[PDB]
Amino acid sequence: TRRPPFAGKTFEVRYDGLTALNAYDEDGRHMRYAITDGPYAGATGEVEYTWQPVAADTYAIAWQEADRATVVHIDDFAAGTSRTFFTAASLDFHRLDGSLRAV
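Above: the chain's sequence. Below: its structure in C-alpha cell form.
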C-alpha cells in the first residue's frame, strides 16, 4: 500500500561524466534506468529499490544491480539535486552529485 511520491514518474539525473534516466514504476518497488551519456551510454536495467525520507521532499533511494554493484541516491525533488554513492562490482567507489529534474 506504501507508495513513494515519485512513483509513476521519470527523472533525468546529470552528473560529471554521466547522464541517466530513473523511471519509477507505478508499483513503488521497481525502477528502470537508462544511461544516456558518458562511457556507459546505452545500458539499461530494472532494479528493486528501497526508499526512506531524510528531509522534506528528500529521499534515500538504494538498490543493487544484477552484477551486485550497489547504488545509494540522496535525491531532493524540490531543489532538483541528486547525490550518489556507487560501489561497482569491482569495488571502485564513486561519488557524484548533480541535478535532478522531472521528464
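The beta strands are 10-15, 18-24, 30-37, 44-55, 58-64, 70-76, 81-87, 93-102.
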